[PDB]
Amino acid sequence: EQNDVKLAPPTDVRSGYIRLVKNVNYYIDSESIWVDNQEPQIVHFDAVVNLDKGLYVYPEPKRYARSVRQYKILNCANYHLTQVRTDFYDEFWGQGLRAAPKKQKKHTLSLTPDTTLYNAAQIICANYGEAFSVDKKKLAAALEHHH
Ligand SMILES: [Cl-]
């Protein structure tokens, strides 16, 4: 029975992180974006959640996470998004000491016009489609201008 810690997730955005959804502390880590030259159209990236409350997910019963890092793979051909791994971090922005549930299950899904990340994914793939590389500066401005 741990007490419930309320956090002050920073409203200031750390450089390199791009807000994915309007007024939500959910970001794409721009340094994570990668596409293999043998599998074009498949974008690998990490999404990062800054928490409002601490998550007690460490061996040490009193330590809590402040953020979540989710490794994902977006297929711009079919708009299938695969969730590969979820890790918990004790600092904001998916940094610091990590804790993870052991041996995790990958899970794919199809982004429909009524899906959450459909808007973001559409912006990511459109940006990627112009050069078969992501322009991080254009992506930030695209996601910012949409919001
Ligand atoms: Cl910064």
Numbering used by the authors: 24 to 170
Give the exact sentences the study uses for this entry.
In the present study, a vaccine antigen based on the fusion of two known NTHi adhesive proteins, protein E (PE) and a pilin subunit (PilA), was developed. PE is a ubiquitous NTHi antigen described to be important for the adhesion of the bacterium to epithelial cells. It is also known to bind vitronectin, which protects the bacterium from complement attack, and immunization with a fragment of PE was shown to afford protection in a mouse model of pulmonary clearance. PilA is another ubiquitous NTHi antigen described to be a conserved protein among H. influenzae isolates. It is the major subunit of type IV pili (Tfp), which are hair-like filaments involved in adherence through ICAM-1 (25).
PE crystallized in space group C2 with a monomer in the asymmetric unit, but crystal packing revealed a head-to-tail dimer on the crystallographic 2-fold axis that had an interface area of approximately 950 Å2, as determined by the software Protein Interfaces, Surfaces and Assemblies (PISA) run within the COOT model-building tool. The PE monomer comprises a β-sheet with six antiparallel β-strands and two C-terminal α-helices, with one of these being formed by heterologous amino acids added in the PE construct used for the crystallization. A disulfide bond exists between Cys81 and Cys130, linking the main α-helix with the end of β4, which confirms the mass spectrometry data (see below). The PE crystal structure is comparable to the published structure, as revealed by their superposition. The recently published crystal structure of PE showed a noncrystallographic symmetry dimer that the authors suggest is the dimer observed in solution, despite the relatively low interface area (∼625 Å2). It was the largest interface in their crystal system, but this type of dimer has not been observed in our crystal systems. The contrasting types of PE dimers observed may simply be due to differences in crystallization conditions.
